[PDB]
Design an enzyme around this catalytic site. Structure first.
Site, PDB file in Angstrom:
ATOM      1  N   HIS A  34       7.911  -5.462  -1.259  1.00  0.00           N
ATOM      2  CA  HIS A  34       6.561  -5.196  -1.731  1.00  0.00           C
ATOM      3  C   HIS A  34       6.056  -3.794  -1.384  1.00  0.00           C
ATOM      4  CE1 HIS A  34       4.455  -5.869   2.106  1.00  0.00           C
ATOM      5  NE2 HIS A  34       5.232  -6.924   2.279  1.00  0.00           N
ATOM      6  N   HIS A  56       3.295   2.439   5.870  1.00  0.00           N
ATOM      7  CA  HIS A  56       3.672   2.125   4.466  1.00  0.00           C
ATOM      8  C   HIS A  56       2.618   2.617   3.553  1.00  0.00           C
ATOM      9  CE1 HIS A  56       1.168  -1.223   5.685  1.00  0.00           C
ATOM     10  NE2 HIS A  56       0.744  -1.203   4.421  1.00  0.00           N
ATOM     11  N   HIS A 103       0.586   2.013  -0.450  1.00  0.00           N
ATOM     12  CA  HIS A 103       0.323   1.242  -1.694  1.00  0.00           C
ATOM     13  C   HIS A 103       0.051   2.267  -2.764  1.00  0.00           C
ATOM     14  CE1 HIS A 103      -0.578  -2.508   0.734  1.00  0.00           C
ATOM     15  NE2 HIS A 103      -0.852  -1.570   1.639  1.00  0.00           N
ATOM     16  N   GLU A 122      -6.105   0.942  -2.325  1.00  0.00           N
ATOM     17  CA  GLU A 122      -6.697  -0.404  -2.020  1.00  0.00           C
ATOM     18  C   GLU A 122      -8.138  -0.180  -1.705  1.00  0.00           C
ATOM     19  OE1 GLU A 122      -3.847  -2.298   0.774  1.00  0.00           O
ATOM     20  OE2 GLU A 122      -3.343  -3.281  -1.068  1.00  0.00           O
ATOM     21  N   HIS A 142      -1.054   3.455   5.033  1.00  0.00           N
ATOM     22  CA  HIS A 142      -1.528   2.609   6.119  1.00  0.00           C
ATOM     23  C   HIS A 142      -0.611   2.787   7.287  1.00  0.00           C
ATOM     24  CE1 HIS A 142      -3.594  -0.301   3.144  1.00  0.00           C
ATOM     25  NE2 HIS A 142      -4.282   0.805   3.380  1.00  0.00           N
ATOM     26  N   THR A 198      -4.009  -6.508   4.007  1.00  0.00           N
ATOM     27  CA  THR A 198      -4.285  -6.602   2.521  1.00  0.00           C
ATOM     28  C   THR A 198      -3.124  -7.261   1.774  1.00  0.00           C
ATOM     29  OG1 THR A 198      -3.244  -4.476   2.078  1.00  0.00           O
ATOM     30  CG2 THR A 198      -5.599  -4.455   2.613  1.00  0.00           C
TER      31      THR A 198
HETATM   32  C1  LIG Z   1       1.112  -5.664   8.758  1.00  0.00           C
HETATM   33  C2  LIG Z   1       0.761  -5.189   7.400  1.00  0.00           C
HETATM   34  C3  LIG Z   1      -0.307  -4.359   7.261  1.00  0.00           C
HETATM   35  C4  LIG Z   1      -0.667  -3.892   6.004  1.00  0.00           C
HETATM   36  S1  LIG Z   1      -2.006  -2.848   5.798  1.00  0.00           S
HETATM   37  C5  LIG Z   1       0.113  -4.310   4.898  1.00  0.00           C
HETATM   38  O1  LIG Z   1      -0.177  -3.903   3.689  1.00  0.00           O
HETATM   39  C6  LIG Z   1       1.173  -5.145   5.114  1.00  0.00           C
HETATM   40  O2  LIG Z   1       1.530  -5.607   6.349  1.00  0.00           O
HETATM   41 ZN   LIG Z   2      -1.044  -1.800   3.660  1.00  0.00          ZN
END
Ligand SMILES: Cc1cc(=S)c(O)co1
Ligand SMILES: [Zn+2]
Length: 257
Positions: free
Chosen positions: A61, A91, A93, A103, A116, A195
């Protein structure tokens, strides 16, 4: 299982994760006119000099760049936080198009992506115990806009060919996350959640006011990753963002005038 498509996307998550409709979900829109300056906030302290990156993983993801969090090497403190939070992974998005992908939004504006940097409160001993607590996490969120390249991002962009599909990882040592930060540490902060499922309400969000610029070629390369595993039909990893959620009984505070 959950994802970002029509049949398993954000509108479906609440069936397996009911807290999707809880009282402190993320992201939210940041209405800058209604975010009050809080002069009791501190400057943030971002201590990444001793950061030890280990590995980059396509988890189906997003891609996570992971850190050694077995000692206080890369920590966030101050700002709205009590105590010390250790960097575990970062990571992003991002969108299928440069007009969407973040986001959080700022007066309903969407940025092309959002970084993030995820930290856990050391008073809880590890990440798994921290996510059982309402103050277990602190996530530093940084918006990406498309314009000039971000030099410090390029080593992440250049390894993405090696982790194209779900479950692939690659060695990723000696990456310095300081190269991903904008100049200013001015921020907004509010209590929220992860999120992505399991959407746990553990997170002090600290979202930087200044975006970083990345090149159109840099974000293009993010969009060549795949949500699927090797040997499965190709589904490009794009639009892995959750839309803004209701603010409910929350106030967003600004660290700056
Ligand atoms: C632990 C974690 C934090 C975020 S912000 C995310 O998108 C997925 O997993
Ligand atoms: Zn995130």
């Amino acid at each position: 299982h959950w994802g970002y498509g029509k049949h398993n996307g954000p509108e479906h998550w609440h069936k397996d994760f009911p807290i999707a409709k809880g009282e402190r979900q993320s992201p939210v829109d940041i209405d800058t006119h209604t975010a009050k300056y809080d002069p009791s906030l501190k400057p943030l302290s971002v201590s990444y000099d001793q950061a030890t990156s280990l590995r980059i993983l396509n988890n189906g993801h997003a891609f996570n760049v992971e850190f050694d969090d077995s000692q206080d090497k890369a920590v966030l403190k101050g700002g709205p936080l009590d105590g010390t939070y250790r960097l575990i992974q970062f990571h992003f998005h991002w969108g299928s198009l440069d007009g969407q992908g973040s986001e959080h939004t700022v007066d309903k504006k969407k940025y092309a992506a959002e970084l993030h940097l995820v930290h856990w409160n050391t008073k809880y001993g590890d990440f798994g115990k921290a996510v059982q607590q309402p103050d277990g996490l602190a996530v530093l969120g940084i918006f990406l806009k498309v314009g000039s390249a971000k030099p410090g991002l390029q080593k992440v962009v250049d390894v993405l060919d090696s982790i194209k599909t779900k479950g692939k990882s690659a060695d990723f040592t000696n990456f310095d996350p300081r190269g991903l930060l904008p100049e200013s540490l001015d921020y907004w902060t509010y209590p929220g959640s992860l999120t992505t499922p399991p959407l746990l309400e553990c997170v002090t969000w600290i979202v930087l006011k200044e975006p970083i610029s990345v090149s159109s070629e840099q974000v293009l390369k993010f969009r060549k990753l795949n949500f699927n595993g090797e040997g499965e039909p190709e589904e490009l990893m794009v639009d892995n963002w959750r839309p803004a959620q209701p603010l409910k009984n929350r106030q967003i505070k600004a660290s700056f005038k």
